Specification:
Chain B: One of its GO terms (biological process) is cellular respiration. By secondary structure, chain A is an alpha+beta fold. Chain A has helices at about 45-55, 65-70, 95-110, 115-130, 135-150, 160-165, 170-180, 195-205, 245-260, 290-305, 310-320, 330-340, 350-355, 360-370, 390-395, and strands at about 5-10, 15-20, 25-30, 75-80, 85-95, 185-190, 220-225, 230-240, 265-270, 275-285, 380-385. In chain A, a hairpin with a 5-residue loop joins strand 1 (about 5-10) and strand 2. The chains are: A alpha+beta, B mainly alpha.
Chain lengths: ~400, ~80
């Protein structure tokens, strides 16, 4: 009974997708298939710095008058960038649907990058990075990406190295903007109280101008020993299958089974036919090795012996979590934008439920043995990590005798 | 034990998986140069004592023989 996500396509290739619902406020966003994976180490912070510059004024709406408009209807304006996708989204009321779309049009095209602003946003970005190091789990996941995807564009961070940040100019940005903002790589996603025909007419009216035009898992480890920190963060991952491979669903159930360290989180990060599947835990130094041992046993267990009931637990757990319908509009659309960018279609919740209920214990331990057993992991540690075991002990813990 | 051995800071340490690296990379490529590099730095400290051991050993042997040699003037 969940309403279907209807997708149309303009000549530009900008797929305009929408999923109407009763809620009177909507989350209209633009997703773009452009991240740090498409950068070539000479423009490693171009997407991040453009994400900073995108709300500082356009040609038609110069400066803060633009954001005055998004204050005037009381709407909320957000943007984010990952290694593969960039999103500019607005939460607003339903009746303010046209102007919001027009605002989004300016943000993707006709944007203006002021040289004055460029220096101010450089100091913002530089400073944030200079303090970003504070967030350990971000440092550990960046280290894990770097040591797992050495020599590839997937190792480099979204923010880029301070070097590039300082060394960036309007023209470079202009390039990234004019290169990675093509209309066939763009989805206009709407969730909530929107009509699809009105949204399609608004996309035809504005946004109809947008121009129309592998990775290797290096199993290895990076350890940043700094003994003055109170807690240690350790992430261990193996290679993931990718977006389009259905056993992801089964792997998600495996994560739902795992769900000794103060904090233990499992992740299945997916990129275009690659990814990182693993666990991140933050612990006191004198516990670290025991955690690792614990964690490896669980994984090995699933690969070795997994019952029927726990599987059911994961199935159900995932089900409720996977549930996103009417979770929130922002989430809803976020899902429409990512589904049109990655799968090329919006997978409905009934298909997700079918793929969940076809998962049993035998295929779960088969897929877990395919992806976890006797695999070389990527290890990233930060903090008092002397008792964190080196690569032979972790690699030997990746199988059982 | 591990964890309480020492205090270091800001020393990042990268590494690779064994199966992801060749077994004897550039083994004889640089091994020979290095072994030779090594031998140079230690040969002058090591070798001349054993050289003079060889000279003393030979000397002793020959001297001993001569010692055993019969005096021409002996019993004549």
């Amino acid at each position: 009974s969940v309403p279907e996500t209807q997708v149309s396509i303009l000549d530009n290739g900008l797929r305009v997708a929408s999923e109407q619902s009763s809620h009177a406020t909507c989350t209209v966003g633009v997703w773009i298939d452009a991240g740090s994976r498409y950068e070539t180490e000479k423009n490693n912070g171009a997407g991040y710095f453009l994400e900073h510059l995108a709300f500082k004024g356009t040609k038609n709406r110069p400066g803060n008058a633009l954001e005055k408009e998004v204050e005037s209807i009381g709407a909320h304006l957000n943007a984010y960038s990952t290694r593969e996708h960039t999103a500019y989204l607005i939460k607003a009321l339903s009746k303010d649907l046209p102007k919001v779309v027009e605002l989004l049009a300016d943000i993707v095209q006709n944007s203006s990058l002021e040289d004055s602003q460029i220096e101010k946003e450089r100091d913002v970005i530089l400073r944030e990075m200079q303090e970003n190091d504070a967030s350990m789990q971000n440092v550990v996941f960046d280290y894990l990406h770097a040591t797992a995807f050495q020599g590839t564009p997937l190792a480099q961070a979204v923010e880029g190295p301070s070097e590039n940040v300082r060394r960036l100019s309007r023209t470079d940005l202009t390039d990234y903007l004019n290169r990675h903002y093509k209309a066939p790589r763009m989805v206009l996603a709407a969730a909530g109280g929107v009509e699809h025909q009105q949204l399609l007419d608004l996309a035809q009216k504005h946004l109809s101008s947008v121009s129309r035009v592998p990775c290797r898992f290096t199993g290895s480890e990076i350890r940043h020993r700094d003994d003055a920190l109170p807690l240690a963060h350790v992430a261990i991952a193996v290679e993931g299958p990718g977006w389009a491979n259905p056993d992801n669903v089964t792997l998600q159930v495996a994560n739902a089974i795992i769900g000794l360290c103060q904090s233990f989180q499992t992740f299945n990060i997916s990129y275009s036919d690659t990814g990182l599947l693993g666990a991140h835990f933050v612990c006191d130094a004198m516990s670290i090795d025991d955690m690792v041992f614990f964690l490896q046993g669980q994984w090995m267990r699933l690969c070795t012996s997994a019952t029927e009931s726990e599987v059911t637990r994961g199935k159900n757990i995932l089900r409720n979590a996977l549930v996103s319908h009417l979770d929130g509009t922002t989430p809803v659309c976020e899902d429409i934008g990512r589904s049109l960018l990655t799968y090329g279609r919006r997978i409905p919740l009934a298909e997700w439920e079918s793929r969940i209920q076809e998962v049993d214990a035998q295929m779960l331990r088969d897929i877990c043995s395919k992806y976890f057993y006797d695999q070389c992991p990527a290890v990233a540690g930060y903090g008092p990590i002397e008792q964190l075991p080196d690569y032979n002990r972790i690699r030997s813990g990746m199988f059982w005798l | 034990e591990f964890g309480n051995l020492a205090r270091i800071r800001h020393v990042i340490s990268y590494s690779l998986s064994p199966f992801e690296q060749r077994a004897f990379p550039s083994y004889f490529s640089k091994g020979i140069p290095n072994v030779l590099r090594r031998t140079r730095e230690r040969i002058l400290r090591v070798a001349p004592p054993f050289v003079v051991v060889y000279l003393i050993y030979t000397w002793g042997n020959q001297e001993f023989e001569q010692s055993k040699r019969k005096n021409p003037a002996m019993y004549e």
